[PDB]
Design a protein around this ligand. Structure first.
Ligand SMILES: Nc1nc2c(ncn2[C@H]2C[C@H](O)[C@@H](COP(=O)(O)OP(=O)(O)OP(=O)(O)O)O2)c(=O)[nH]1
Ligand SMILES: [Mn+2]
Ligand SMILES: [Mn+2]
Length: 430
DNA sequence: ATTATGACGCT
DNA sequence: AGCGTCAT
């Protein structure tokens, strides 16, 4: 009733770049533009592993985690760009720098939370109030929302996708009450106007296209963003949630795509997000824990409180390489050489970070995996990071891991190492 | 022999 | 602190 909070207090957007690494390579090399193309890491094994795919190539069934040789069977004309290799490993610097370009543009409009290399949440509540006071009760023209979809519309009473988009937008705009500056639907609409401007700025100033979601919280904004890709944005209103969730598989909601979501499905005997509404908060807490249970109870009603954190920079800076099958490291010289390669990349990135961002990392985390273990990490150990010196960090990493060598011969390494990882953490202002 | 990360929760 | 989960 009057006291039942509805989670409509904020306007939150999620901006995610379309096929990011592909767009970075297409900007650099115009010959790849408007083509089926993909970005690969390495080349000798099955043509390299695909990590990003243009929408033209997706039409042929090309996906991430596919080997390039197999993708070429689906799409013989597929074009490929390779990630840079430095010190024997993949180097993602080009894409991190392109990410900074986009993040700095978004930060002009509002404080952002960097959620990944290619996506950020935006809290637009205050910008929306400002724009509403500027509008002075003026209604919002469809011309201000030229790439916006309104989820759930059109409804009720022609055969083109753009025509349906405009039909839905006109239904939405016709139903709007522009007199009330507190109306959540109006606030979301103004938020979408701002996100159109943000996305136009990103494309004008970088050449990159993106999609976006606009809703009242982070989970709904992320889900909305996915509904109309590429190069479009989607408004998910509070009122759209019952219908949207009534056929939404639980795994589509961020954080429910793994073991927890599978357990929701199995324990409760349901398939769709909306079915969660029939359980009490205590029932959900009893199965999934106090925190998850409260989160699910609110989330299946469209309500989530997780704040957009003011954080534009990554919290950690890390370097990792797998050594699969026969390439696994089985000598001490090998382990030391590769720890040095990783540490040299880490030193480069840390020194640039300190110059750009006025901070220093203080803890070095070393992670390995040994032959046989299905786990991502077989062991993690931390030590002090007191100097941005690659030889020092590699010697310290070796010191903290060397007790894993069960070979009585110190020259051999047994079992062989199938992963090395170095991560700088615990930043302090400098 | 998908690979390279990065965030956050649990105990 | 070290380990697991989830994102992709
Ligand atoms: N190294 C590495 N990079 C990855 C991996 N998965 C994704 N990436 C990179 C390449 C992607 O372009 C970028 C952003 O990922 P997204 O999930 O947002 O997909 P992408 O932007 O490629 O396409 P989309 O957002 O669906 O239009 O992250 C991976 O497993 N390893
Ligand atoms: Mn993306
Ligand atoms: Mn993304």
């Amino acid at each position: 009733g009057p006291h039942m909070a509805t989670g409509q207090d904020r306007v939150v957007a999620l901006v995610d770049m379309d096929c990011f690494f592909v767009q970075v390579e297409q900007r650099q090399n115009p010959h790849l533009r408007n083509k089926p193309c993909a970005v690969v890491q390495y080349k000798s094994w099955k043509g390299g592993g695909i990590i990003a795919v243009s929408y033209e190539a997706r039409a042929f069934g090309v996906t991430r985690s596919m080997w390039a040789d197999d993708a070429k069977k689906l799409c013989p004309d597929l074009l490929l760009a390779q990630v840079r290799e430095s010190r024997g490993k993949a180097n993602l610097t080009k894409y991190r720098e392109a990410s900074v370009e986009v993040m700095e543009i978004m930060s002009r409009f509002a404080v952002i939370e960097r959620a990944s290399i290619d996506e950020a949440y935006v809290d637009l509540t205050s910008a929306v109030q400002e724009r509403l006071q500027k509008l002075q009760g003026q209604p919002i023209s469809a011309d201000l929302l030229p790439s916006t979809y309104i989820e759930g519309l059109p409804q009720g009473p022609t055969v083109q996708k753009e025509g349906m988009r405009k039909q839905g937008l006109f239904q939405w705009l016709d139903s709007l009450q522009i007199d009330n500056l507190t109306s959540p639907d109006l606030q979301l609409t103004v938020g979408a106007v701002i996100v159109e401007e943000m996305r136009a700025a990103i494309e004008r100033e970088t050449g990159f296209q993106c999609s976006a979601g606009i809703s009242h919280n982070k989970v709904l904004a992320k889900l909305a963003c996915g509904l109309n890709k590429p190069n479009r944005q989607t408004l998910v209103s509070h009122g759209s949630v019952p219908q949207l969730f009534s056929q939404m598989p639980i795994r589509k909601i961020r954080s429910l795509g793994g073991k927890l979501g599978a357990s929701v499905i199995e324990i409760l005997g349901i398939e769709y997000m909306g079915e969660l509404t029939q359980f009490t908060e205590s029932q959900l807490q009893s199965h999934f824990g106090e925190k998850n249970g409260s989160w699910l109870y609110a989330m299946c009603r469209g309500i989530e409180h997780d704040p957009v954190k003011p954080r534009q920079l990554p919290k950690t800076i890390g370097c990792s390489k797998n050594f699969p099958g026969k390439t696994a490291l089985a000598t001490r010289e090998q382990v030391q050489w590769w720890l040095l390669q990783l540490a040299q990349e880490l030193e480069e990135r840390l020194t640039k970070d300190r110059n750009d961002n006025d901070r220093v990392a203080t803890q070095l985390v070393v992670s390995i995996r040994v032959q046989g273990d299905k786990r991502l990490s077989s062991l993690r150990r931390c030590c002090a990071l007191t100097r941005y010196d690659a030889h020092k960090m590699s010697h310290d990493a070796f010191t903290v891991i060397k007790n894993c060598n069960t070979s009585g011969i110190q020259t051999e390494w047994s079992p062989p190492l199938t992963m090395l990882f170095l991560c700088a953490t615990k930043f302090s202002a400098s």
